[PDB]
Structure formats: C-alpha cells, structure tokens
Design a protein around this nucleic acid. Structure first.
Ligand SMILES: Nc1ncnc2c1ncn2[C@H]1C[C@H](O)[C@@H](COP(=O)(O)O)O1
Ligand code: NA
Ligand code: NA
Length: 326
DNA sequence: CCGACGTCGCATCAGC
DNA sequence: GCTGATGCGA
DNA sequence: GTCGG
C-alpha cells in the first residue's frame, strides 16, 4: 500500500538481472534497494526522497519518478511482453535449472513445464526432481509441520545413536510461523577436526530417515553435506502433506555450536555480531573464532562449546533466538 | 576512475 | 582414467 | 547498481 508498488518493481528487476542478464551483483543491489524501502514508514513521494536511503542511487531514483508519474515502468513493460526473457525467468523457478540452463533451453524452443515433460531426457537427476515437485517447493512450511518434522528427525537421530546432537536452525529457531526449508545440523564426539573424514556418520543417519519413509528423494549427497526431499506420514481421510525440502549438514564438535549460531540467523544479526566481534579483538568465520593481533593477524582459534560460550568473549549476553532479528 | 559487494560441497562437463 | 573449471542451491 | 577508496 505504502511502498509496495515500488518494492514489487525493484524485486522484478532484481530477478530479471539474476536470471536473464546473469548479473548477481545488480540483483543484490536491486534486492538491497527494496529492503531499505520495505523498512521505510512513509509513502515515498519522489525518487529524490528515496535516494537518501543507503543502497538507492540515481538510476533507481529516476525509475521511481516514472513509476509515480506514468503509473508504471516503461522498460519493465517491454521485459514482460518479451517472450524470450519472460520464459527464461520462468524456467529458473524449477529447482535445478539456473540462469544458464534456462537460456540453453529457450534457444531450443523449450519454454514451459509442458515442453520440459516432453524433453525430460535432457534434464539431469536434479532437474527432474525439481519439475516433479514444482508446486510443492513454492509452498511455505507452517511451524506446526516443522514441529512434527523435527520430532521425527530427533527421534530417528537419537534412535540410531544417543551421542548424536541435531538442531534445526534457520527461521525455525527464531520462532517463525513459517520456514520453507528444513535445515538440520548434526555432530558426533567421534568427529572433531583432526579426526579423519567420516563417510559413515552422515550416511548412517540418512539411511535411518529413508528407512521410516521420511526422506523421499535425493538431490545430492556426500561425506559432509546432504540435500534432498522429505514428507510427513499420510493422514487419514485428509490428503497427504506436500513434499518439503530438507538439508542435513555434518559439522565437527569444534565448529558445531559456532556453526549453529551462524545458520540460526538472522542475516542482520550476523553483521552486527561480526562488527562487534572485531571491536573487541575477535573475528568470526562461521567455523571458528580467532583472536587477531595488532596488525590483524588472526591467531589460534579459541575453544567453543556452547551458544553463550561465544558471547563470553565479545562481552555480550546470551540473546534469545526469538530476538536475534536485528 | 574503478574494483568490491560470502561460501562452499556436490554433480556435471572439458580437456588431457 | 584423473584433474580442474563451471553450474547450481541455501 | 550502489558504495567507497
Ligand atoms: N550475500 C550473502 N552473503 C552471505 N550470507 C548471505 C548472503 N545472502 C544471503 N545470505 C544468508 C542470510 C540468511 O542467513 C540466508 C538465507 O536464509 P533463508 O532462510 O535460507 O532464505 O542466507
Ligand atoms: Na543512497
Ligand atoms: Na532454478
């Protein structure tokens, strides 16, 4: 209502720049421009007013002038009508098809899901699974579902080994009523840096979840990370729950809790905590915490074993995930 | 002017 | 066959 | 595209 019309404009140009022009840097720029505006409690009456905000320059200021004066963006309308560009942006929506594949497909005449089904012998394992759950992937995951899903993973991860620590991070940790992705992090005492690579640990857990029919498909799998699809048990009378995305990541006990807080969020929280860490003399790198020197030479990573453990370094108190928004 | 805007493990591909 | 670049996803 | 050395 306020600046929703402008934000929608910037977000469209953002996706265009990512999928069509393949300019991730201009994509992030347009995305950042829409962010600061979405936090502005006032109706932007002119581009000059918007340029004041960090992330908005002259180009975006001029665009707003046209959007308010004419009622839309002239350059944006040409993009929408352009069959070639509008189709490329669509194909990328499919998990597996990126900005490169989408273009290669359109050149061959493949532009829709219907056209994809015909030429399925041209899609790899990932691209096929994506097409299969095209809609199920674009749907949001309610907290209640996340809770039910969590119990299963926790029950199965402990049922296979009591020394397994698994915590679902992300928006879920912050108490979000939604999620859209099930990011799980796990560790074991038998895995601590110096310890040799463990292709048995992650594989062990994955097999157990597939054993109870939770994990349906697999996008990619290795010795440390896992990416696939999952689904809750079919309910009586009612229709079965949609297929959801799930990522499992094995992390050492030395980088576990340090890696937990990072994936716990938020995106703004990481920035504020990264800057404050440097103010005291420490530097965060997702994995460990290093005490830099007078010239900035990071030293030997100091021991970490908990969530508050890291706060007991930068003179900060334990801030609850429900408040780690900013 | 003009270069920096995170990352990185896994699957597919190129070249040798 | 092995090595190394490129594409993809959060 | 937007910022800052
Ligand atoms: N450019 C860049 N650098 C570093 N981290 C980034 C960047 N862009 C996004 N993110 C992080 C911020 C969130 O923790 C996560 C997305 O959360 P999700 O719930 O998966 O949408 O990705
Ligand atoms: Na600005
Ligand atoms: Na895609």
């Amino acid at each position: 209502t306020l600046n929703g019309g402008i934000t929608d404009m910037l977000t469209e140009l953002a996706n265009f720049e990512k999928n069509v022009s393949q300019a991730i840097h201009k994509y992030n720029a347009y995305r950042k421009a829409a962010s600061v505006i979405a936090k502005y409690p006032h109706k932007i009456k002119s581009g000059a007013e918007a340029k004041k905000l960090p992330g908005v320059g002259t180009k975006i200021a001029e665009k707003i002038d046209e959007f308010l004066a004419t009622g839309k963006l002239r350059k944006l309308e040409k993009i929408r009508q352009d069959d070639t560009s509008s189709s490329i942006n669509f194909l990328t929506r499919v998990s597996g098809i990126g900005p490169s594949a989408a273009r290669k497909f359109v050149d061959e005449g493949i532009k829709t899901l219907e056209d994809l089904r015909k030429n399925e012998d041209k899609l790899n394992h990932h691209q096929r699974i994506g097409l299969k759950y095209f809609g199920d992937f674009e749907k949001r995951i309610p907290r209640e579902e996340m809770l039910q899903m969590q119990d299963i993973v926790l029950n199965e991860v402990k049922k296979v080994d009591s020394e397994y620590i698994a915590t679902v991070c992300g928006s879920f940790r912050r108490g979000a009523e939604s999620s859209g992705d099930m990011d799980v992090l796990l560790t074991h005492p038998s895995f601590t840096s110096e310890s040799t690579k463990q292709p048995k640990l992650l594989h062990q857990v994955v097999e157990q979840l597939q054993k109870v029919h939770f994990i349906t498909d697999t996008l990619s799998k290795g010795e440390t990370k896992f990416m696939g699809v999952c689904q809750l048990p079919s309910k009586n009378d009612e229709k079965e729950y949609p297929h959801r995305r799930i990522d499992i990541r094995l992390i050492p006990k030395d980088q576990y809790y340090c890696g937990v807080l990072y994936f716990t969020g938020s995106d703004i929280f990481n920035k504020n905590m990264r800057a404050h860490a440097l103010e005291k003399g420490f530097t965060i790198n997702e994995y460990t915490i290093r005490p830099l020197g007078v010239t900035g030479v990071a030293g030997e990573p100091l021991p970490v074993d908990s969530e508050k453990d890291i706060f007991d370094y930068i003179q900060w108190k334990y801030r609850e995930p429900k408040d780690r928004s900013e």
